[PDB]
Amino acid sequence: QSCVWYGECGIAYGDKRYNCEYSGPPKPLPKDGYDLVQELCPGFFFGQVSLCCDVRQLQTLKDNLQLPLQFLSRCPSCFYNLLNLFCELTCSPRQSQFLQVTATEDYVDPVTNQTKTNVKELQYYVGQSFANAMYNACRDVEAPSSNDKALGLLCGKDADACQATNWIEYMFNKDNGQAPFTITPVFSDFPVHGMEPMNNATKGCDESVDEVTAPCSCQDCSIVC
Ligand SMILES: *[C@@H]1O[C@H](CO)[C@@H](O[C@@H]2O[C@H](CO)[C@@H](O)[C@H](O)[C@H]2NC(C)=O)[C@H](O)[C@H]1NC(C)=O
Ligand SMILES: *[C@@H]1O[C@H](CO)[C@@H](O)[C@H](O)[C@H]1NC(C)=O
């Protein structure tokens, strides 16, 4: 297994950071991060918890997920696939199979003056079926106390223009003021020049995420009506 990054490096803009380039194997997560990994990415919470992310990155992921939560929290299945998209990107011990760094710049440690490397941009190979299922689970979610679709607030365009691939492209575009750096998505259910797209299992809005979480309401999910 191999990583493309590990830990945070320099400022991109505002309070947002690039991650540090790293091409070695994943590393067992410190125990002080177990609460975060359980909350955000429980699928990775087993064995040595060897990941391509550190505690800082998990904390940042939690902070960065606030706005999707703002609009999608009422449909746990919809939010769950979105979390997994970000969990795989952030932490997967097999990152190198589906991420390709495309731009870097040097990072200088202000005290030690040792040089590290900011990952400025990368390409993310995302399963076509994954992306379609993620959209499918979220497409009927209403903005809370409204009759408009939640995706019209997370897609950089009205819901009638929002589609699976342009939703993911928008969320990953730093021009949105939220994403710390741009990720360029490539959608395929098939390998591409040796890259194996991320095609994790997904949950529909008519399914329970787990034993303690119900399916989404009829209001947010036309299947259950
Ligand atoms: C993406 O899918 C993989 C494959 O199903 C998940 O990795 C498994 O996670 C389960 C649950 O903890 C473990 O029992 C397995 O041992 C894992 N399998 C392998 C081959 O790694 C992974 O959890 C999913 N990612 C996320 C973010 O949930
Ligand atoms: C998702 O796809 C299913 C068919 O697999 C369909 O019944 C449903 O209309 C779609 N939308 C939602 C919100 O689940």
CSV table of C-alpha atoms and ligand atoms in Angstrom, one decimal:
chain,number,residue,atom,x,y,z
A,1,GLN,CA,0.0,0.0,0.0
A,2,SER,CA,1.1,3.6,-0.7
A,3,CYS,CA,0.2,7.1,0.2
A,4,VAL,CA,0.4,10.4,-1.9
A,5,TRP,CA,0.2,12.6,1.3
A,6,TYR,CA,0.5,12.7,5.0
A,7,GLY,CA,-0.2,15.6,7.4
A,8,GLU,CA,-0.7,19.3,6.8
A,9,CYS,CA,1.8,21.7,5.3
A,10,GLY,CA,1.5,25.4,4.2
A,11,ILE,CA,-1.4,27.9,3.9
A,12,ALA,CA,-3.4,27.8,0.7
A,13,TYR,CA,-5.7,30.7,1.5
A,14,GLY,CA,-7.7,32.0,4.5
A,15,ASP,CA,-7.4,29.4,7.3
A,16,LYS,CA,-7.0,26.6,4.7
A,17,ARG,CA,-4.0,24.3,4.2
A,18,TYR,CA,-2.4,22.1,1.7
A,19,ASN,CA,-1.3,18.6,2.7
A,20,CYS,CA,2.4,17.5,2.7
A,21,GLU,CA,3.5,15.3,-0.1
A,22,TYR,CA,4.4,11.7,1.0
A,23,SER,CA,4.8,8.5,-1.0
A,24,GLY,CA,5.6,5.9,1.7
A,25,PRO,CA,3.3,3.4,3.3
A,26,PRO,CA,0.4,4.3,5.5
A,27,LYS,CA,1.1,4.8,9.2
A,28,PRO,CA,-0.8,3.6,12.3
A,29,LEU,CA,-2.9,6.4,13.6
A,30,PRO,CA,-2.2,7.6,17.1
A,31,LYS,CA,-4.8,6.8,19.8
A,32,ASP,CA,-5.6,10.4,20.3
A,33,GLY,CA,-7.2,10.3,16.8
A,34,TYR,CA,-9.4,7.2,17.4
A,35,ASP,CA,-12.5,9.3,18.4
A,36,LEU,CA,-12.2,11.2,15.1
A,37,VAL,CA,-11.7,8.2,12.9
A,38,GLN,CA,-14.7,6.5,14.6
A,39,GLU,CA,-16.9,9.5,14.0
A,40,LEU,CA,-15.9,10.3,10.4
A,41,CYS,CA,-14.5,7.1,8.8
A,42,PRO,CA,-15.5,4.1,11.0
A,43,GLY,CA,-14.9,1.8,8.0
A,44,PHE,CA,-11.1,2.3,8.6
A,45,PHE,CA,-11.3,1.7,12.4
A,46,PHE,CA,-9.8,-1.8,12.7
A,47,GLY,CA,-6.4,-3.4,13.1
A,48,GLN,CA,-3.5,-1.0,13.5
A,49,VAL,CA,-5.6,1.8,12.0
A,50,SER,CA,-2.9,2.4,9.4
A,51,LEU,CA,-3.9,5.4,7.2
A,52,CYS,CA,-2.5,8.0,4.8
A,53,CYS,CA,-3.8,10.8,7.1
A,54,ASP,CA,-2.8,12.1,10.5
A,55,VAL,CA,-4.9,13.6,13.4
A,56,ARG,CA,-4.6,17.1,12.1
A,57,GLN,CA,-6.1,16.1,8.7
A,58,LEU,CA,-9.0,14.3,10.4
A,59,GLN,CA,-9.8,17.4,12.5
A,60,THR,CA,-9.6,19.6,9.4
A,61,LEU,CA,-12.0,17.1,7.6
A,62,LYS,CA,-14.5,17.4,10.4
A,63,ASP,CA,-14.4,21.2,10.2
A,64,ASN,CA,-14.7,21.2,6.4
A,65,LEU,CA,-17.8,19.0,6.4
A,66,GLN,CA,-19.8,21.6,8.3
A,67,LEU,CA,-21.6,23.0,5.2
A,68,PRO,CA,-22.5,19.7,3.6
A,69,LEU,CA,-23.9,18.8,7.0
A,70,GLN,CA,-25.8,22.1,7.1
A,71,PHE,CA,-27.8,20.9,4.1
A,72,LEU,CA,-27.7,17.1,4.1
A,73,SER,CA,-27.8,16.1,7.8
A,74,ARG,CA,-31.4,15.2,7.8
A,75,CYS,CA,-30.8,12.3,5.3
A,76,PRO,CA,-28.0,10.1,6.9
A,77,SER,CA,-27.6,7.8,3.9
A,78,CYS,CA,-27.0,10.8,1.6
A,79,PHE,CA,-24.4,12.3,3.9
A,80,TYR,CA,-22.8,8.9,4.5
A,81,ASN,CA,-21.6,8.3,0.9
A,82,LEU,CA,-20.3,11.9,0.8
A,83,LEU,CA,-18.3,11.3,4.0
A,84,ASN,CA,-16.9,8.1,2.4
A,85,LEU,CA,-15.8,10.0,-0.7
A,86,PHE,CA,-13.9,12.4,1.5
A,87,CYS,CA,-12.6,9.6,3.9
A,88,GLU,CA,-11.1,7.7,1.0
A,89,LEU,CA,-9.5,10.8,-0.4
A,90,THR,CA,-8.2,11.9,2.9
A,91,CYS,CA,-7.1,8.7,4.6
A,92,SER,CA,-7.2,5.5,2.5
A,93,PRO,CA,-4.2,3.3,2.9
A,94,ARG,CA,-4.4,2.6,-0.9
A,95,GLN,CA,-4.5,6.3,-2.0
A,96,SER,CA,-1.9,5.8,-4.7
A,97,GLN,CA,-4.3,3.5,-6.6
A,98,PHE,CA,-6.7,6.3,-7.2
A,99,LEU,CA,-4.9,9.6,-6.6
A,100,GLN,CA,-2.3,11.3,-8.7
A,101,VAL,CA,-0.5,14.4,-7.6
A,102,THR,CA,-0.4,16.9,-10.4
A,103,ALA,CA,1.0,20.1,-8.9
A,104,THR,CA,3.4,20.9,-5.9
A,105,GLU,CA,5.3,23.8,-4.4
A,106,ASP,CA,7.9,23.9,-1.7
A,107,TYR,CA,7.0,24.3,2.0
A,108,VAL,CA,9.7,25.8,4.4
A,109,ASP,CA,9.5,25.0,8.1
A,110,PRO,CA,9.9,28.5,9.7
A,111,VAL,CA,12.0,27.2,12.7
A,112,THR,CA,14.1,24.3,11.3
A,113,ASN,CA,14.1,25.7,7.7
A,114,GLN,CA,13.7,22.1,6.4
A,115,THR,CA,11.9,22.0,3.1
A,116,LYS,CA,8.7,20.0,2.6
A,117,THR,CA,6.3,19.9,-0.3
A,118,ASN,CA,2.7,21.2,-0.6
A,119,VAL,CA,0.4,19.1,-2.7
A,120,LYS,CA,-1.2,22.0,-4.7
A,121,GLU,CA,-3.5,19.9,-6.9
A,122,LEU,CA,-4.3,16.3,-7.6
A,123,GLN,CA,-6.5,14.1,-9.8
A,124,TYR,CA,-9.0,11.7,-8.0
A,125,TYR,CA,-10.2,8.6,-9.9
A,126,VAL,CA,-13.8,8.2,-8.7
A,127,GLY,CA,-16.0,5.3,-9.7
A,128,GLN,CA,-18.8,6.2,-12.1
A,129,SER,CA,-21.2,4.0,-10.1
A,130,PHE,CA,-20.0,5.5,-6.9
A,131,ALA,CA,-20.6,9.1,-8.1
A,132,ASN,CA,-24.1,8.2,-9.5
A,133,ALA,CA,-25.1,6.4,-6.3
A,134,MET,CA,-23.9,9.4,-4.2
A,135,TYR,CA,-26.1,11.7,-6.3
A,136,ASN,CA,-29.0,9.3,-6.3
A,137,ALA,CA,-29.0,9.1,-2.5
A,138,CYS,CA,-29.0,13.0,-2.2
A,139,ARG,CA,-31.0,14.3,-5.1
A,140,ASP,CA,-34.4,14.5,-3.4
A,141,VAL,CA,-33.1,15.9,-0.1
A,142,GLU,CA,-34.9,19.1,0.7
A,143,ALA,CA,-33.2,22.2,2.2
A,144,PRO,CA,-34.4,22.2,5.8
A,145,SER,CA,-37.7,24.1,6.2
A,146,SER,CA,-38.0,24.6,2.4
A,147,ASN,CA,-39.4,23.1,-0.8
A,148,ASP,CA,-36.1,23.4,-2.7
A,149,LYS,CA,-33.5,20.7,-3.2
A,150,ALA,CA,-30.4,20.7,-1.0
A,151,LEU,CA,-28.1,20.1,-3.9
A,152,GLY,CA,-29.0,23.6,-5.3
A,153,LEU,CA,-27.0,25.0,-2.3
A,154,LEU,CA,-23.9,22.7,-2.6
A,155,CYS,CA,-23.5,22.5,-6.4
A,156,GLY,CA,-22.7,26.2,-7.3
A,157,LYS,CA,-25.8,26.1,-9.5
A,158,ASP,CA,-29.6,25.5,-9.2
A,159,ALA,CA,-30.7,21.9,-8.5
A,160,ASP,CA,-32.1,21.5,-12.1
A,161,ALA,CA,-28.6,22.0,-13.5
A,162,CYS,CA,-26.9,19.9,-10.9
A,163,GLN,CA,-25.7,16.4,-11.9
A,164,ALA,CA,-23.5,13.7,-10.3
A,165,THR,CA,-20.2,14.7,-11.9
A,166,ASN,CA,-20.6,18.4,-11.8
A,167,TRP,CA,-21.6,18.3,-8.1
A,168,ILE,CA,-18.3,16.5,-7.2
A,169,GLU,CA,-16.3,18.7,-9.6
A,170,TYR,CA,-17.7,21.8,-7.8
A,171,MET,CA,-17.2,20.6,-4.2
A,172,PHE,CA,-13.6,19.8,-5.2
A,173,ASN,CA,-12.9,23.3,-6.7
A,174,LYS,CA,-11.1,25.7,-4.4
A,175,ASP,CA,-12.8,28.5,-6.3
A,176,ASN,CA,-15.8,27.6,-4.1
A,177,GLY,CA,-14.2,29.3,-1.1
A,178,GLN,CA,-14.4,26.2,1.0
A,179,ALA,CA,-12.1,23.6,-0.5
A,180,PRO,CA,-8.6,24.3,0.5
A,181,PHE,CA,-7.1,23.2,-2.8
A,182,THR,CA,-8.5,21.9,-6.1
A,183,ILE,CA,-9.0,18.1,-6.8
A,184,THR,CA,-9.8,17.3,-10.5
A,185,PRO,CA,-12.1,14.3,-10.6
A,186,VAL,CA,-12.0,11.5,-13.3
A,187,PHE,CA,-15.1,9.3,-13.4
A,188,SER,CA,-14.7,5.6,-14.5
A,189,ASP,CA,-15.9,2.2,-13.5
A,190,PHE,CA,-12.8,0.8,-15.3
A,191,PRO,CA,-9.1,1.2,-14.6
A,192,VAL,CA,-7.4,4.1,-16.3
A,193,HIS,CA,-3.7,3.7,-17.2
A,194,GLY,CA,-3.2,1.5,-14.2
A,195,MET,CA,-5.3,3.6,-11.8
A,196,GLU,CA,-8.1,1.7,-10.1
A,197,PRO,CA,-11.0,4.1,-9.3
A,198,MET,CA,-12.5,4.4,-5.9
A,199,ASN,CA,-15.7,2.4,-6.1
A,200,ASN,CA,-16.7,1.8,-2.5
A,201,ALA,CA,-20.1,0.3,-1.6
A,202,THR,CA,-22.9,2.9,-1.2
A,203,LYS,CA,-26.2,3.2,0.7
A,204,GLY,CA,-29.4,4.4,-0.9
A,205,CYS,CA,-31.6,6.9,0.9
A,206,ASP,CA,-34.1,4.0,1.5
A,207,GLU,CA,-31.5,2.1,3.5
A,208,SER,CA,-30.3,2.4,7.1
A,209,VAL,CA,-26.6,3.5,7.5
A,210,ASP,CA,-26.3,1.2,10.6
A,211,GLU,CA,-28.4,-0.3,13.4
A,212,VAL,CA,-28.9,3.0,15.2
A,213,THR,CA,-29.7,5.2,12.1
A,214,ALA,CA,-33.0,5.2,10.2
A,215,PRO,CA,-33.5,5.5,6.5
A,216,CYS,CA,-34.3,9.0,5.2
A,217,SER,CA,-37.9,10.4,5.3
A,218,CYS,CA,-40.3,10.4,2.4
A,219,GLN,CA,-39.8,14.2,2.1
A,220,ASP,CA,-36.1,13.7,1.3
A,221,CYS,CA,-36.3,10.4,-0.5
A,222,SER,CA,-39.1,9.6,-3.0
A,223,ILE,CA,-38.4,5.8,-2.8
A,224,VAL,CA,-39.7,5.5,0.8
A,225,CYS,CA,-43.0,7.3,0.1
B,1,LIG,C1,-14.3,1.3,1.4
B,1,LIG,O1,-14.5,-0.1,1.1
B,1,LIG,C2,-13.5,-1.0,1.7
B,1,LIG,C3,-13.8,-2.4,1.2
B,1,LIG,O2,-15.1,-2.9,1.6
B,1,LIG,C4,-13.6,-0.9,3.2
B,1,LIG,O3,-12.5,-1.5,3.9
B,1,LIG,C5,-13.1,-2.6,4.7
B,1,LIG,O4,-13.6,-2.1,5.9
B,1,LIG,C6,-14.3,-3.1,6.7
B,1,LIG,C7,-15.0,-2.5,7.9
B,1,LIG,O5,-14.1,-2.0,8.8
B,1,LIG,C8,-13.2,-4.1,7.2
B,1,LIG,O6,-13.8,-5.2,7.9
B,1,LIG,C9,-12.4,-4.7,6.1
B,1,LIG,O7,-11.3,-5.4,6.5
B,1,LIG,C10,-12.0,-3.6,5.1
B,1,LIG,N1,-11.6,-4.3,3.8
B,1,LIG,C11,-10.5,-4.0,3.2
B,1,LIG,C12,-10.1,-4.9,2.0
B,1,LIG,O8,-9.7,-3.0,3.4
B,1,LIG,C13,-13.6,0.6,3.7
B,1,LIG,O9,-14.0,0.6,5.1
B,1,LIG,C14,-14.5,1.5,2.9
B,1,LIG,N2,-14.2,2.9,3.3
B,1,LIG,C15,-14.8,3.7,4.1
B,1,LIG,C16,-14.4,5.1,4.2
B,1,LIG,O10,-15.8,3.2,4.8
B,2,LIG,C1,-32.4,6.5,-7.0
B,2,LIG,O1,-32.4,5.4,-7.9
B,2,LIG,C2,-33.5,4.5,-7.7
B,2,LIG,C3,-33.4,3.3,-8.6
B,2,LIG,O2,-32.2,2.6,-8.2
B,2,LIG,C4,-34.9,5.3,-7.9
B,2,LIG,O3,-35.9,4.5,-7.4
B,2,LIG,C5,-34.9,6.6,-7.2
B,2,LIG,O4,-35.9,7.4,-7.9
B,2,LIG,C6,-33.6,7.4,-7.3
B,2,LIG,N1,-33.6,8.6,-6.4
B,2,LIG,C7,-33.6,8.6,-5.1
B,2,LIG,C8,-33.9,9.9,-4.4
B,2,LIG,O5,-33.3,7.6,-4.4
